[PDB]
């Protein structure tokens, strides 16, 4: 959390800018599955940077 | 059929047990930010000789 420099002094602002969220064949879904996009990434030996 | 049927009172509690707080005060502050920009210059050219 960061302070809100312009505005109320008791405001906390979230500024999350990331280009490094990896999706790959070794990462599973919240339900534990690795189907669909994940399976194709595993077969193609590819990973995504979201 | 003419009778007084109802009434309402202007009764209040004595807040000596401080059951009620009423309105609240809190101290606050706001911040404003004013950055100063640069502007294009004006130039007077002259020869170096």
């Amino acid at each position: 959390f960061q302070p809100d420099l312009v505005g109320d002094t008791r405001n906390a602002v979230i500024r999350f800018d990331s280009d490094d969220l990896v999706v790959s064949g070794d990462t599973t879904f919240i339900d534990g599955s690795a189907d669909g996009v994940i399976n194709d990434l595993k077969t193609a030996k590819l990973s995504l940077r979201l | 059929d003419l009778a007084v049927i109802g009434f309402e009172l202007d009764t209040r509690f004595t807040n000596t047990n401080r059951r009620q707080r009423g309105h609240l005060l809190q101290t606050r502050a706001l911040q404003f930010r004013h950055p100063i920009p640069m502007h294009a210059p004006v130039t007077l050219p002259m020869d170096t000789m």
Side-chain angles (χ1 to χ4, degrees), chain A residues 1-16:
Chain A
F1 288 5
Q2 297 179 32
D4 193 7
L5 296 174
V6 178
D8 197 291
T9 60
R10 299 301 301 170
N11 286 351
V13 297
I14 299 169
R15 297 174 179 176
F16 185 84

Side-chain angles (χ1 to χ4, degrees), chain B residues 12-31:
Chain B
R12 65 190 70 194
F13 288 95
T14 55
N15 201 34
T16 63
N17 63 10
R18 301 182 65 179
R19 176 180 289 280
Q20 301 296 335
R21 293 187 294 177
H23 285 291
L24 312 178
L25 304 180
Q26 295 285 274
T27 301
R28 306 291 189 184
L30 305 174
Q31 183 176 310

Side-chain angles (χ1 to χ4, degrees), chain B:
Chain B
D1 187 356
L2 177 64
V4 177
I5 62 171
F7 65 98
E8 294 183 327
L9 306 176
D10 197 25
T11 299
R12 65 190 70 194
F13 288 95
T14 55
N15 201 34
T16 63
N17 63 10
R18 301 182 65 179
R19 176 180 289 280
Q20 301 296 335
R21 293 187 294 177
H23 285 291
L24 312 178
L25 304 180
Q26 295 285 274
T27 301
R28 306 291 189 184
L30 305 174
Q31 183 176 310
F32 303 77
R33 184 178 177 91
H34 299 286
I36 298 168
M38 290 173 73
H39 311 269
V42 58
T43 300
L44 195 162
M46 65 179 288
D47 58 273
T48 61
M49 291 302 295

